[PDB]
A paper describes a structure:
The adjacent fibrinogen (Fg)- and fibronectin (Fn)-binding sites on Fn-binding protein A (FnBPA), a cell surface protein from [name], are implicated in the initiation and persistence of infection. The N-terminal region of FnBPA contains three subdomains N1–N3; N2N3 binds fibrinogen (Fg) and elastin. Here, we solved the structure of the N2N3 domains containing the Fg-binding site of FnBPA in the apo form and in complex with a Fg peptide. The Fg binding mechanism is similar to that of homologous bacterial proteins but without the requirement for “latch” strand residues.
However, only [name](189–505) produced diffracting crystals. The structure of [name](189–505) comprises two distinct β-strand-dominated domains, N2 and N3, connected by an eight-residue linker. The N-terminal N2 domain (residues 195–335) consists of nine β-strands arranged in a sandwich of four- and five-strand β-sheets. The N3 domain (residues 344–503) has a similar structure comprising two β-sheets, each formed by five β-strands. However, unlike N2, the two β-sheets within the N3 domain are linked by a short helix. The structures of both domains resemble a distorted β-barrel rather than a typical β-sandwich. The N2 domain adopts the DE variant of a C-type IgG fold (DEv-IgG) identified in other proteins including ClfA. The asymmetric unit comprises a single copy of [name](189–505); no density was observed for the N- and C-terminal residues (residues 189–194 and 504–505, respectively). In the apo-form, the G′ strand aligns anti-parallel to the neighboring F′ strand.
Numbering used by the authors: 194 to 503
């Protein structure tokens, strides 16, 4: 069928931030929300379609690999289905149920997640959706978390991708020294929820960051295929890496004197209510043990998804 974008009118359009404030915290699992009330011209047919375009600071998926959006209904009847085509382009295609309908209107609510690749820093973003030349627009202040640190090191992470069809997810962790200090460390990954005790061993890849620390994305984002920014050292570190069938890994680094990224791709147990992935770093700043012993510091950062509640 044909492009009937010019036949769709936005009657009411708005974009809102978390709880209808002007702020969004993506690392607390918050998001923006686009709401539309659309009027349609008469005489549309099945297979006819309309497109709108989102600013590339947001998308409709967050960590999900899936690319569906909500259906446009008239009560119970599916009027249109929607798909993400590309940048960042949402197309709704009309069903058979638009045929011979008159004065059709419809509401549409779509969650809009802040993209960590295009929104790398804290601060205001202007979020827009454009439908048939009508621009709907909202400024939101995006605020990210800084990980967890001490005088010696910082640990931060985020789930990168989530793939329901394969029971897989990927995760990015950044580990760095602070204050010019070098400590010897053990870094672990553990599925605190959602471990498949009898699964495959995870793929874990480690990269040396080559840039200035000031340019590390606040969003927690590593484009590890930029070879001026990242150097893969997985080979070099392979004798210090252990992988387990319950999804855990462990990694020893004798001198933490550089910023590293650890990329994890693993599976989770089918049916789990939740997936909760812990990255933990244990450091030993001193090993003289004169007058005292203790085990050093521990930094712990968890990233979790809810798959069922409840």
């Amino acid at each position: 069928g044909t492009d009937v974008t010019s036949k769709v009118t936005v009657e009411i359009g708005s974009i809102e931030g978390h709880n209808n404030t002007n702020k969004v915290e993506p690392h607390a699992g918050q998001r923006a929300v686009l709401k539309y009330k659309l009027k349609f011209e008469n005489g549309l047919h099945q297979g006819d379609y309309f497109d709108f375009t989102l600013s590339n600071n947001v998308n409709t998926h967050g960590v999900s690999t899936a690319r569906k959006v909500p259906e446009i209904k008239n009560g119970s009847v599916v009027m249109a289905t929607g798909e993400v085509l590309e940048g960042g382009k949402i197309r709704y295609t009309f069903t058979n149920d638009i045929e011979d309908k008159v004065d059709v209107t419809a509401e549409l609510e779509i969650n809009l997640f802040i993209d960590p690749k295009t929104v790398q820093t804290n601060g205001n973003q202007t979020i827009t959706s454009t439908l048939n030349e009508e621009q709907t627009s909202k400024e939101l202040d995006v605020k990210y978390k800084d990980g967890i640190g001490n005088y010696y090191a910082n640990l931060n992470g985020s789930i990168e991708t989530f793939n329901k069809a394969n029971n897989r997810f990927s995760h990015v962790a950044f580990i760095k020294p602070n204050n010019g200090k070098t400590t010897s460390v053990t870094v672990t990954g553990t599925l605190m929820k959602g471990s498949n005790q009898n699964g495959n061993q995870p793929k874990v890849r480690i990269f040396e960051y080559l840039g200035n620390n000031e340019d590390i994305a606040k969003s927690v984002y590593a484009n590890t295929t930029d070879t001026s920014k990242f150097k893969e050292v997985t080979s070099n570190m392979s004798g210090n890496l252990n992988l387990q069938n319950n999804g855990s890994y462990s990694l020893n680094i004798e001198n933490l004197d550089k910023t590293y990224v650890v990329h994890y791709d693993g599976e989770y147990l089918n049916g789990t209510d939740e997936v909760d992935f812990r990255t933990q770093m244990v450091g030993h700043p001193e090993q003289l043990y004169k007058y005292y012993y203790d085990r050093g510091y521990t930094l712990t950062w968890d990233n979790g998804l809810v798959l069922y509640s409840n």
